[PDB]
UniProtKB/TrEMBL annotation:
Top-level taxon: Bacteria
SUPFAM superfamilies according to UniProt: Periplasmic binding protein-like I (SSF53822)
Residues given in the record as Ca(2+) binding sites: 306, 319
GO molecular-function terms, A-Z: metal ion binding
Swiss-Prot/TrEMBL GO biological process terms: amino acid transport
Keyword annotations: Amino-acid transport, Calcium, Metal-binding, Signal, Transport
InterPro entries: Leu-bd, Leu_Ile_Val-bd, Peripla_BP_I
Leucine-binding protein domain segment(s): 3-337
Family: Belongs to the leucine-binding protein family.
Protein name in the entry: ABC transporter, substrate binding protein (Amino acid)
Pfam families per UniProt: Peripla_BP_6 (PF13458)
Length: 348
């Protein structure tokens, strides 16, 4: 009987681009695995659930998945969605592997079922905070976050690391997801002589801040994290995006092993940037662990994930006892025009 694997992701709403990364990556992996014989001889059946980046809607999705006999979830994207959804899954026999949720809490609750293919924000903030001190030691820095545990969590980790390395921010402020007029905040930053804005949050608000700062005459460079790795950042911000910095893990589209896979996505009309191959890899981890376990039972797959190593589009993957992957860490990217003439994130 088919192995039912769900993709839980923000298929609509502000983060739809990240939903597409996750959906397209998981769907292609399932197709490729199926063409190779499935998982232990059984075909994968994909079901989709749209969380709209809204924890309440994510919980409805999680319930739908339980009802539909889902055994594994690739998702969700947002930490505030994934953390509550994971409890529903943990209590109903479902293994959850997130390609993109980075808040430490996700794997720090002693749940049997939680895994990631991405890093976590104590790692990410350590890299970011050190970078601020190394390159902007004397700058006046504003730390701004989106009042979510992802965004504020990342901002707080970065703050801790920056402070320890000798950078004391001149502002620390929260804004609400969905708010779009940043004029007052931008004016406050300009008054304070801010030249670096560290942003703990997602691409929509980041793009709005970048665009508005340029228009309002605030000369400041925005530095953020994994939340801004989408072409849509450039679409909102316009050319003012140039020079923006952000942390992200390795860019898997640049791995030589993935050359043909990336070409295939493009032949299907999709640019498989950012988390696309992290989602592809999450599917591959499930398949590899089931093969090692001799079982598709989620609890047995979880045990196998914590024991072995498995081939993936991110490279060979293995997991610690909490479900975090043992993979390369965060690096700093800068936004510049790529070979195709579009602004994108390029490793420094
Ligand atoms: C899609 C990602 C930017 C999500 C973010 N890492 C979070 O944990 O909420």
């Amino acid at each position: 009987m088919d192995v039912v694997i769900a993709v839980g992701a923000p298929l609509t709403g502000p983060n739809a681009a990240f939903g597409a990364q996750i959906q397209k990556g998981a769907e292609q992996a399932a197709k490729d695995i199926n063409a190779a014989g499935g998982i232990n001889g059984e075909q994968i059946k994909i079901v989709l659930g749209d969380d709209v980046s809204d924890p309440k809607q994510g919980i409805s999705v999680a319930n739908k998945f339980v009802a539909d006999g889902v055994k594994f979830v690739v998702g969700h994207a947002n930490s505030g969605v994934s953390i509550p959804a994971s409890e529903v899954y943990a209590e109903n026999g479902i293994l959850e592997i997130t390609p993109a949720a980075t808040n430490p809490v996700f794997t720090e609750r002693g749940l049997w079922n939680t895994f990631r293919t991405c890093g976590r924000d104590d790692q990410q903030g350590g890299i970011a905070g050190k970078y601020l001190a190394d390159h902007f030691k004397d700058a006046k820095v504003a730390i701004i976050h989106d009042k979510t545990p992802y965004g504020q969590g990342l901002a707080d980790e970065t703050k801790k690391a920056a402070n320890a390395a000798g950078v004391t921010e001149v502002m620390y402020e929260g804004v609400n997801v969905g708010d779009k007029d940043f004029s007052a905040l931008i004016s406050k930053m300009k008054e304070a002589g801010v030249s670096i804005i560290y942003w703990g949050g997602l691409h929509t608000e980041a793009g709005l801040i970048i665009r508005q700062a340029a228009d309002q005459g605030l000369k400041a460079k925005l530095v953020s994290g994994d939340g801004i790795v989408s072409n849509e950042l450039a679409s909102i911000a316009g050319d003012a995006v140039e020079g923006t910095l952000n942390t992200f893990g390795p860019d898997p589209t640049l791995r030589p092993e993935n050359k043909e896979l990336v070409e295939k996505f493009k032949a299907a009309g999709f640019n498989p940037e950012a988390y696309t191959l992290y989602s592809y890899a999450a599917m591959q981890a499930i398949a590899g662990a089931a093969k090692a376990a001799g079982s598709v039972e989620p609890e047995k797959v979880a045990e196998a994930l914590k024991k072995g190593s498995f081939p993936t589009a991110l490279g060979e993957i293995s997991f610690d006892e909490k479900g975090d992957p043992k993979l390369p860490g965060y690096v700093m990217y800068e936004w510049k025009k790529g070979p195709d003439g579009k602004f994108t994130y390029i490793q420094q």
